[PDB]
Structure formats: C-alpha cells, structure tokens
Amino acid sequence: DDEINAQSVWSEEISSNYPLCIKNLMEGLKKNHHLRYYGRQQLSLFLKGIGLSADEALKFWSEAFTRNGNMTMEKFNKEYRFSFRHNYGLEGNRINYKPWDCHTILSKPRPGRGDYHGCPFRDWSHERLSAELRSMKLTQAQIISVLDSCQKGEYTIACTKVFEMTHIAHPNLYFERSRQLQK
Numbered sequence: 693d694d695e696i697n698a699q700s701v702w703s704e705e706i707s708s709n710y711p712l713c714i715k716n717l718m719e720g721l722k723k724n725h726h727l728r729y730y731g732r733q734q735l736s737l738f739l740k741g742i743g744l745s746a747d748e749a750l751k752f753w754s755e756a757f758t759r760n761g762n763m764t765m766e767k768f769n770k771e772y773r774f775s776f777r778h779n780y781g782l783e784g785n786r787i788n789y790k791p792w793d794c795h796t797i798l799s800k801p802r803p804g805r806g807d808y809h810g811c812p813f814r815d816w817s818h819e820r821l822s823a824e825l826r827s828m829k830l831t832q833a834q835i836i837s838v839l840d841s842c843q844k845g846e847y848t849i850a851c852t853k854v855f856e857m858t859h860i861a862h863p864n865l866y867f868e869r870s871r872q873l874q875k
C-alpha cells in the first residue's frame with residue numbers, strides 16, 4: 693500500500709501515468725460521485741491491476757460515491773459494496789476478473805449519454821480530444837498526427853503516440869511503462 697492506495701490514486705504523481713480512458717473514468721467519478729456499470733468495471737479492474745488492495749479499493753469506492761453528500765454510506769453499503777467486493781473475490785466467487793485490455797475495452801458496448809467507459813480516441817470528438825491533448829502540452833503537429841490515427845481507426849496507435857509525445861495493447865501496460873519512467 694506504500695505506493696498504490698486509496699489516497700495516492702488521486703495524486704497527480706500517480707494519475708499522471710493513467711492513459712486517457714482511465715483519466716476520463718476518474719474525471720467522471722470525481723465530477724459525478726458515481727460511475728455506471730461498465731465504467732465501474734473498467735476502472736475498478738484497472739485499479740486492481742495496478743495493485744490497489746481490497747481494503748484500499750473499498751475505501752476508494754465508498755469515499756468517491758459518498759463524496760459531497762452524493763449518497764449515504766448506508767446506500768453505498770446496500771447498493772454497491774457487494775459489487776466491488778465481488779470484483780475482488782471477497783464473497784468467495786472464483787470468476788477470473790482480470791483488468792480489461794484495449795481490445796476488450798473497445799469491444800464493450802460503445803458509451804452513450806452518461807457513460808465514461810470505452811476508449812476516448814474513438815469515443816471523443818476531435819475537438820474534445822484536441823483540447824485534452826493541448827492540456828497535455830502537445831502542439832498542433834502532434835495533435836494532427838494523433839487525430840490522423842483516430843480517423844484511421846487506429847486507436848491504440850493514437851494512444852501509443854500520446855505516450856511517446858508526453859514522455860499486447862493494455863491500459864495497465866501504459867500505466868506500468870509510464871510509472872517506470874518516474875523511477
């Protein structure tokens with residue numbers, strides 16, 4: 693828990709290593725104090741894969757869902773705690789829940805209104821992507837290249853370009869490669 697824990701996953705240092713899909717899920721969680729089912733699964737299993745423990749996950753999800761008075765702890769415990777415990781096998785299930793790779797993410801139903809799961813290189817408009825990439829200090833030529841990959845449907849190449857420009861396809865590999873470059 694020394695490095696990855698319920699508090700450090702909200703730090704700029706750790707979160708600077710997240711790929712765009714995880715950044716988007718964390719932003720939706722931060723703003724709405726909730727994620728719908730597919731996003732809960734994508735984000736909770738990514739965090740499990742980076743080493744967020746069972747206890748630290750339950751802290752993280754209970755604090756994020758009850759933040760700013762969004763729901764009572766009693767409602768969280770009645771309507772969500774089981775689901776997050778299940779993702780960690782804490783009620784005894786033996787389903788093999790592994791972190792989702794990019795192909796798996798892309799193959800989930802596309803996000804609609806109110807959804808934050810998916811792959812932003814496919815799911816965001818070019819304008820929204822451009823604004824986000826400018827926030828990450830990319831220049832116009834860089835953004836044009838990333839958008840070229842997006843328009844060709846080469847979403848994991850677009851994501852690889854963003855990794856290279858800001859420093860098998862799998863969000864957890866993006867995180868691990870990025871985190872290693874901080875050490």
Ligand code: SF4
Nearest residue numbers: 711713794811851863
């Ligand atoms: S390419 Fe994969 S890691 Fe990158 S944003 Fe899309 S789903 Fe996430």
